[PDB]
Symmetry: D2
């Protein structure tokens, strides 16, 4: 299986370009040139590329310099036919951001954080980006008495309301996707799970403009079911973007290739996104890989790992489709009553008065008998895994 532009695989400049300088060691790879990255990604089948401001234009470049880089970049885009679906802002590397960007205790950093983002918004607008991803990696704390959470939420809100105002006035048409993470680099980060981020967004001035950008690994760092949180995000209609990668439970952020961590959950996730409502996908945005080529790899390893991401997705897609088309699976789904959940509990026009009048829903209900029948969930699970292993 080969990738098509229709597959919408995108990669951040910072994924393949990660020099593998970790918390305990020096970089093992030299810098990757952006024009080069565009060319290489175009070649493996990516339809788009994304970047933080500081990944493209080095922090503090004079305008001449900055202007020069963008022009080169745009040309590479042009030539390869690659788009920029999303852009983001680095509000975490520079020391000024050590206590946060939008929620730093220091009022002056907060002000600067907003200016840095407005600037990136203009560039995204210029390149045709549709989504602004906001990853508040430095928002949070190491000690509970150091951060007033309430005030922090007020200030996070204050900042986002302004960005939407500006986008709307200017006619940029951007959608804003908040990216949740429980920890790292901060002991605890504000808006730690998909849920916390969706609940927060519901409180902004133009909520219709806000959604989330959940990352496989970030939910798994708390041992949460990623597929299940994406299902809820889809239910709320707030899945604006997705970051795919791999992780092995709660430990530092690994950023493995998609599917290299929890494989079973990678399978159920592809099934969810692709075997949507009609026959059609339940999700129509970019399939963005936010991973890191392992520190043990050279540039051959980097390109191999980029390809591996696409390969894992396409292989899982193929088995998800086969799973749903199998008659034996249909039968197992029927025995487990999966579809019965979609039928309303109440009959049309039934309220509490009618339910209370139904002796069979309670007074004459044989709970003991119903409780003895099996759901056949193990058998259904076993057919799924056999599809995954190509055993059927």
């Amino acid at each position: 299986v080969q990738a098509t532009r229709e597959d919408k695989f995108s990669f951040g400049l910072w994924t393949v370009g990660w020099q593998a300088r970790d918390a305990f060691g020096d970089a093992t790879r030299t810098a990757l040139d952006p024009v080069e990255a565009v060319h290489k990604l175009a070649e493996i089948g990516a339809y788009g590329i994304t970047f933080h401001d500081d990944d493209l234009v080095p922090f503090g470049s004079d305008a001449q310099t900055r202007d020069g880089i963008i022009a080169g970049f745009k040309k590479a885009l042009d030539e390869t036919g690659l788009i920029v679906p999303m852009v983001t802002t680095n509000l975490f590397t520079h020391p000024v951001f050590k206590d946060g960007g939008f929620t730093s205790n220091d009022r002056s950093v907060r002000r600067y954080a907003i200016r840095k983002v407005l600037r990136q918004m203009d560039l995204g607008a210029e390149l045709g980006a549709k989504t602004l991803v906001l990853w508040g990696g430095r928002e949070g704390a190491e000690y509970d008495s150091a951060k007033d959470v309430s005030a922090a939420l007020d200030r996070y809100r204050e900042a986002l309301n302004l960005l939407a105002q500006y986008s709307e006035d200017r006619g940029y048409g951007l959608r804003f996707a908040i990216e949740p993470k429980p920890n790292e680099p901060r002991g605890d980060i504000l808006l730690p799970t998909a849920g916390h981020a969706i609940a927060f967004v519901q409180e902004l001035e133009r909520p219709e403009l806000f959604g989330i950008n959940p990352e496989t690994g970030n939910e798994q760092m708390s041992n949460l079911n990623f597929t299940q949180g994406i299902a809820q995000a889809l239910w709320h209609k707030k899945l604006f973007h997705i970051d795919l990668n791999g992780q092995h439970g709660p430990k530092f952020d690994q950023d493995l290739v998609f599917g290299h961590g929890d494989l079973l959950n990678a399978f159920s996730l592809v099934d969810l996104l692709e075997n949507g409502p009609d026959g059609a996908p339940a999700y129509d945005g970019p399939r963005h890989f936010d991973y890191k080529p392992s520190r043990t790899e050279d540039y051959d390893g980097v390109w191999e790992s980029a390809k591996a991401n696409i390969r894992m997705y396409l292989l899982l897609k193929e088995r998800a489709k086969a799973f749903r088309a199998d008659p034996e699976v249909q039968e197992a789904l029927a025995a487990s009553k999966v579809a019965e959940l979609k039928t309303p509990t109440l009959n049309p026009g039934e309220g509490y008065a009618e339910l209370l009048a139904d002796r069979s829903a309670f007074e004459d209900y044989d709970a003991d008998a119903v409780g003895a029948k099996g759901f056949g969930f193990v058998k259904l699970n076993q057919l799924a895994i056999e599809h995954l292993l190509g055993a059927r």
Copy 2:
């Protein structure tokens, strides 16, 4: 320290009444008589008691029995002065609920679960309860393909909307509090965190009647910061009730005495609830203990553990108070700029255009100079712990 009714300490009948039958062994204690529980709790300083329908009236009791039990319980409350601030329904023990109550794949189970709850709502209203707690312990799955999360959320919503309709029509004036839990007993439970529960509630028909009942150990089972989560719940004004207990990170649900698990977090929590805006608590409801006397204890051990919860809460309060009152802390708070987060980032009437025109927010900003000043956070943190330790 002594507990007063103004402290609002409540205990579930199922807490002190837990017979200590765990997943690997038989009960080590005999059954506690509801009436006796009422007298003992009154005695240790509790202001109220809570119960699941099946904790007071054995599942399947005739109305004659059922009625008799309610009558006696009512007398005991009478004589002791205890109130019933909250009631809940057992939608997890009986085999019929093996796949959930409200979200069972079986339609008949769903109808049945609603009836069970309406009935408990009646008793609650009769005893003066103000909050109905809903713990969906069996709503979820062990396998991804077994549960359509979207359909599940629709059915959860359908059931809750009917419940609010009924209470409002009967004039019960109840508040509904959804209690989030990540897992146990299902592999994964729907609405796994305080964040997911809040996001869901915002989608109901009468959202103002719904909030959450977060539990200390539930959030800690995912290694989340309970205090930070409550802070967010408070920002949303959805903290309708709270279950206090202890846990040692991600492992089975321990249900230790409040403060016997993450002690540092227990401290920041009491500080949050009690040192609210303008002296006054930030939270006004019951301080409810949903814990279990360890399996190694006898009734002596049981009463001891009941008192330990009150004791822990009162000792923490006392230190939280002293912490805030200390001029040295006051000074460290100032140096760390904790209160500066309360000042809007933007000046009065300032928008994007005035901010874009302010050179000091970007063009002329010295990020390197600001990036080098320390926040003094370790020192503030050490002052808090010395207060906790009674060394200051």
Copy 3:
């Protein structure tokens, strides 16, 4: 595929016999008759059955009854051809063991626990069992000041020394396998990991008679790499038995079918046990499934789940072999230098003197040139996974 007796699939009576009473609900299945269990397991392909004393003969059975049960049990084995490779003792269910068996604070409990095991050793010897599995599920504490760990290790040693003495004197020829578990049911269990259990065994009187019985889920409950721990156990030659099941990281003990938790680690484990040196398996004992059919299931789901354990192991075995036989994998192993780790670091006869004299190992070593070369681990991992997906 199909299981043969040479596969050595064994199951505990308590596995398929689990009635599904969990920490939060009643049993959903009726009791399983042991003779029937023997028959059903024989039919699905098991070569042996195991059990706790109390699984077979009800706690507090008179001599007559006990004798009666054993004789019927022996006939079923007879008739079917199943053997009893291992036996174990229940030291966790009865209330008397709430603080442990062998390390109970109470001396009379320790004496009783020893007696209870001697008696099972006799029945085990009589049924032809080769291994005595010892799971100290109640050995540990909820509170640090409640248990003197050093004294508990002394008492643990003291009880095992005696069991070895007895078995050697009676000529039973048993091997003893300690099973480590980090928590559940105690807050913290003694000998929490495979490592702690091997270190302990080394301090016994006749260490050659002791090894471990690691369980997949137990190590995963602590987020450790099961395959890697089993590779260490085999290095030490302490892999006396193994319990196979599934788990989804740090949370309550799930006991899923083998391969239904961490699929990637189940694959690497099967590869390690089967693609041993000299073509042959690195492990020759029983492949024992210590799992539980989900509570949502009836007796059909029970046999279905029993068969799934076998099918999972065999499908994985098949892919592990294809993996190792693939020329492209062979090429990736070479580029990764996996086998170069097997060649000694020092040339034959070289010691520190000769190493010190080698300028090429330090003074003239180009660490920078070496550090630039990649290991091709990502490609190697991608090939393993494609073999697992049946995509190659």
Copy 4:
């Protein structure tokens, strides 16, 4: 309280010298001069300093440069009276060590790793160090097939045996302490817990020269009980050194000040170390702080944090002492039967024959009556916390 040289508090040069460059951002602090670090530490009460070769002498310094640094270093030590109790080698920073030191798949890296270590042993021996700590941070894997564990353990052992040999031949009198860590920077690290390292040490040629250097957060990263694993290390007599710090369960390595993570476990750890058998401490080596001043701090916060480690230890020690001298705590200990575990289970001269003969141990044992007695553990835990809280 004030620290005395008798307290034996030591710090790594790399703790107070951490420039705070994390996985997501640049350093926030300038480098600390080693001579200045020696003077500052002496001033806060440390008795010793430790260092990795590369902390003191920049990787690749010519011999003139290295010699000068060493001489200024020794003068500072001289002048302040601080000693060097342990030394260590950096086998994790340079790109060459990306696949490990002693266990890299690449043979030449393994030879270079041993020479780097031998060179540090000479410098340690000349500074008077008695312990060589070995932290194999890069020994491990991100993928299961990339590393042969058995070969890795063989290579590990091969390097360690040579080091013992050289030391013994040179009369250096060093003791070796392996430091276990579960993950970070490798996905999975070899010898993941104190248990795994102890079991490995037992297989070396001269086991008596080898022990472990366990770190508080390292075991907490796996959610294990640190005090309980230290208790077991003490039972084996392998606690050669200890690294003290704070962590909040399973997440990246936080390296907080000691006591700022799991306060209750810090308390029980100090109790174990100081309130050893015979009035005296159970452990007499250095109390080493391997922590990092938070990225939010400047040099004032760095010294505040160094002082916080010592304060934390002394406050907990004071409370542990008061705890044990409390006649009420003693009475609770007697009621909980803690000391009764210290009494052999078997009577002097009793063997299995006599045990089998004691009907009080079984035939006439009333399991049921014993099973109903409470142990009073909750009450005991409550008194312990009241002491920590300074409430008693």
